[PDB]
Paper text:
Citrullination, the loss of a positive charge on the arginine side chain to form citrulline, is catalyzed by peptidylarginine deiminase 4 ([name]) of the PAD enzyme family. [name] is implicated in rheumatoid arthritis (RA), where citrullinated epitopes serve as important diagnostic and pathological factors. In this study, we identified GAGs as physiological allosteric coactivators of [name].
To explain the lower activatory potential of shorter oligomers, we determined the structure of [name] with Dp12 in the absence of calcium. The Dp12 oligomer was again bound proximal to the region spanning a loop including R123 to R137 of the bottom dimer. These structures were observed in the micrographs as a separate 2D class. By plotting the maximum [name] activation and Ca0.5 versus (vs) oligomer length, we determined that approximately 12 sugar subunits in the GAG chain are necessary to achieve half of the effects of native heparin. The observed change in the dimer–dimer organization between Dp12 and Dp20 at 0.1 mM Ca2+ consists of the introduction of an additional GAG anchor point for a longer Dp20 oligomer, which introduces torsion sufficient to pull the dimers together and form the 90° double-propeller, cross-like structure.
Numbering used by the authors:
A (entry chain B): 2 to 56, 65 to 97, 105 to 157, 173 to 311, 316 to 337, 349 to 371, 384 to 395, 403 to 516, ...
B (entry chain A): 4 to 37, 42 to 54, 70 to 155, 172 to 217, 226 to 337, 350 to 370, 388 to 397, 401 to 518, ...
């Protein structure tokens, strides 16, 4: 997007070096004779002079005669073409070269030329844009090494005398050097003695490229993830330096730039197909083995502190594990940056709220409502991390009335074949009381619960009935919040009975084991053992959830009583999103 | 939304804040399978068939608890008619500020979505001024947000109101109570005590930090209603309303703006200079003051435009270098209003100096200053090439002057080429032995014209101004007719840097149309200096009455813009 200014003088020759693809303008009113208004331009075969007037060729030399000097080919000898500016004679010698820097700019996964739209000047969000994508090395302390790196090729086409008085430099801005590492490849073999040229210690390297046709390749990799200080963009640059006289400082002629964006960390919701179970009671383990066998997923024996997300690039997609203070060749630990634990984090299935579409879902974590002395909040650094990665926007719910403080204690997402496709499950202290009252009216009012009290005591303990009220006005507030940022109607909210007992520091804890914290392996489910009244063979408590979930198509098993699950990445690719 | 669930066993109570949707759920607890409304409520339905949403709306805030009543009847042949009684209470709570950016508190009767900030010619948001500096200064610059409540007199014995700022933006906001701090850098939350009836509480707001690297500049203040009906149990939240604020950025003023006041620090040995600058003060009207690299700007809010000073009431701003030769304030310049490839920058673009590519001696501005000036999106930075100079400021070869035709401004770039043209044409018409440097080496024009070592140094310099010329042409979207080439001469010295040969003229003092210009002590031809005639014949046709001084720092404050920054769309 640069242009040169070759100011021609009619009393001495002028020599120029223009790079093809640059609007070269030959300014005339620089040393022209005071008299006359008819100069003309006698050109040469190798130069296309597209002279136009202000918005042979006997043109009036009024101020504003724009002259252009676009050419065709790369010179094989200095001064191949010539220009004459008559005055009724100015001489101009000219030589040309071809410098280019082309990475994967159209995001096709190839080495596409830099001639794409808008070249490589800015990153533009959306399905119609330009800009290459880099990966952070998910590694801890040849072909296999280069399988996870980009490839920037520098093609030089210069005559065989050009690089005795010229050179090139490759540089990265001093503010961003700690976040890029550029390897270099020798022409002997694609993988032969690769050493770093630019990195966190040397921000500018003087290349040596011999004259003539020559295309040599760099590999590029990142070193850090998006964060508060780091928006996500790196800029690499080439520069041609003229060093004709060996007694004066060098000068700049040509500067080509390429922009890169660092791939972010994306989580996987519960509504995606499974790929592997990294398991850590022997009966529970046997039940998990049966559940995996019925779901034909790979189970490995060696813990809710990590989430197996992925980093997506046009060439490769790599799983990544993030844990707050299984390996193989591809996993990596992010080291970027009760309420601050990792249980307070769930990513929602694909949703579209308020017209704007969020193809990758929305991240959900919990905090308090009014900051106070005794309020527990998520660590600010991790919040800023998960907000810096804008592919999944943060959503803040209310979890400070629970002793544990996690969010998974009262919400969960399951698949569905009809309506939207995903069903939101909310714990409800209200449906269980209605079920117990109905069972009492049906004739059973002395049942054995936790077999430990009877249904009578549970339905006549006034303190419990007053406690569940406050634990019902908070899940309702979370419900109204979830129905505003996810655009959920009243039909996609299934209620799962689960009582609470306000006893510990006036906080909330479950009465019988939670039925909302489930284990979803594709279509199949694993639900904790809800000890409850055994009314007519089957238990009443383990009947409502079955009758509420089975008609969808989902199955429900009941494990008597911490395994991580990896899920396939999204088919939608984040560089097509428009945040 | 506020879902209200009525039970057919016992009556239910509820409090509603007016202006918010209030649906009631009725299919959930209905016995079997298949509404009397009082004057104070409105009931409507739009598709006990599951999914029949029914909504309630109010007309006015209640007078006493449970005056308006809604009865839902489950009529049935098989099951005797059941009834659900819902005793509603209605209250009004509003928290409003200058959301529509006029200048009034703009009492919002639920008309605007005050919970978002959007750049645009017309939209929603509140502007907050910084406190770069209670009986005074409270009625003038601190923003006003008012809280109006209409509730029964026996209602706040049970319900309490709290006000909270997020704990990540508490060192940057301070809220005072009208006759006194309630929130600030130590107390995220305050518990207000609002009586019954009606009560308009006035809240004053101030900020404490300019937009920077970590602060995007968006403070949100929120009111919450808490139900303290019981004493053993903790309370729950029922209603939350918020107002968003944006911190006013630091804007700089370019050359073309007419002056308001001209400052100086002249003490002694100035002599003629002072007289000369004073002469300008009377010709181009200014207020001339009299008693070190500071730069003057302003901050704008719909209640006040305040002049501020950036150093390295008036106050000061210090958010940058918490320094090399390029971090001084002569390195920063502001372009007049500009248009680039369609996108219009009505307030101009900042220009700063930096090298081309990093090396062992690529002196660059401290990254704190660059990121501070890029946090203010009002005037986006443009990185020039000013490393070849010893001092390295960009004021040594470029400057803008007010033009009355075409675009409106003239960019004056130094050009070593034109001075050779002047001397060559002068010698082509005789008298080619004129003297030069008459001030205080009296080298002849012939010696300068025949020198074989100055030409290389000037050629290299001409290879550097062209690059900045092309960069400016692309970035600012200019053409050839807006660039004048003042003659100047350069000479390379030790450490291979460039310094002016005879005193520079591009660093000129612009008092409107009037121009104070330092003197090229040079040739004496025909009676008037040649370096004093090219500039005249190039500038005076614009109308600028050029004057020549014998140069000293004179900072000039210039009148703020007409185009407001909130109207911009970055």
């Amino acid at each position: 997007a640069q242009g040169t200014l070759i100011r021609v003088t009619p009393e001495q020759p002028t020599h120029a070096v223009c790079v093809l693809g640059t609007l070269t303008q030959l300014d005339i009113c620089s040393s022209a004779p005071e008299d006359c208004t008819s100069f003309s331009i006698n050109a040469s075969p190798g130069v296309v002079v597209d002279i136009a007037h202000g918005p042979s060729s006997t043109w009036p030399l009024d101020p504003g005669v724009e002259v252009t000097l676009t050419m065709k080919v790369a010179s094989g000898s200095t001064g191949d073409q010539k220009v004459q500016i008559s005055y009724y004679k100015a001489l101009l010698y000219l030589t040309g070269v071809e410098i280019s820097l082309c990475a994967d700019i159209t995001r096709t996964g190839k080495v596409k030329p830099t001639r794409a739209v808008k070249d490589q000047r800015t990153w533009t969000w959306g399905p119609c844009g330009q800009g290459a994508i880099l990966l952070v090395n998910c590694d801890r302390d040849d072909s296999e090494d280069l399988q996870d790196m980009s490839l920037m090729t520098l093609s030089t086409k210069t005559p065989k005398d050009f690089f005795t008085n010229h050179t090139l430099v490759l540089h990265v801005a001093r503010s961003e050097m700690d976040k890029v590492r550029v390897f270099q490849a020798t022409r002997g073999k694609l993988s032969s003695k690769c050493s770093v040229v630019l990195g966190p210690k040397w921000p500018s390297h003087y290349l040596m490229v011999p004259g003539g046709k020559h295309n040599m390749d760099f590999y590029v990799e990142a070193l850090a993830f998006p964060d508060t200080d780091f928006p996500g963009l790196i800029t690499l640059t080439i520069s041609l330096l003229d060093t004709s006289n060996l007694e004066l400082p060098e000068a700049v002629v040509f500067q080509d730039s390429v922009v890169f964006r660092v791939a972010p960390w994306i989580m996987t919701p519960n509504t995606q197909p499974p790929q592997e179970v990294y398991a850590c009671n022997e009966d529970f383990l046997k039940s998990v083995t049966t559940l995996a066998m019925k779901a034909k997923c790979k189970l490995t024996i060696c813990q809710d502190e990590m989430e197996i997300g992925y980093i997506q690039a046009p060439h490769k997609t790599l799983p990544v594990v993030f844990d707050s203070p299984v390996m193989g060749p591809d996993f990596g630990y992010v080291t970027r940056g009760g309420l601050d634990s990792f249980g307070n984090l769930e990513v929602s299935p694909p949703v579209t709220v308020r017209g704007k579409e969020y193809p990758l879902g929305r991240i959900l974590f919990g905090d308090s409502c009014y900051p106070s002395n005794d309020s527990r909040q998520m660590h600010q650094a991790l919040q800023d991390f998960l907000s810096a990665q804008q592919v999944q926007a943060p959503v803040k719910l209310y979890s400070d009335w629970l002793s544990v403080g996690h969010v998974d204690e009262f919400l969960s997402f399951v698949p569905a074949p009809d309506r939207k496709g995903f069903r939101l499950l909310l714990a409800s202290p209200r449906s269980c009381y209605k079920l117990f009252q109905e069972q009492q009216n049906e004739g059973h009012g002395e049942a054995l619960l936790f077999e430990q009290q009877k249904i009578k005591n549970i339905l006549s303990n006034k303190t419990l009935r007053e406690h569940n009220s406050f634990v019902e006005r908070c899940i309702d507030w979370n419900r109204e919040l979830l129905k505003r940022e996810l655009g959920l109607a009243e039909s996609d909210i299934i209620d799962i009975p689960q009582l609470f007992k306000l006893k510990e520091f006036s906080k909330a804890e479950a009465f019988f084991p939670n039925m909302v914290n489930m284990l979803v392996l594709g279509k199949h489910l694993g639900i904790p053992k809800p000890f409850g009244p055994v009314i007519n063979g089957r238990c009443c408590l383990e009947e409502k959830v079955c009758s509420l979930l089975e008609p969808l198509g989902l199955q429900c098993t009941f494990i008597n009583d911490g395994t991580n699950v990896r899920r396939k990445p999204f088919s939608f690719k984040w560089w097509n999103m428009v945040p």
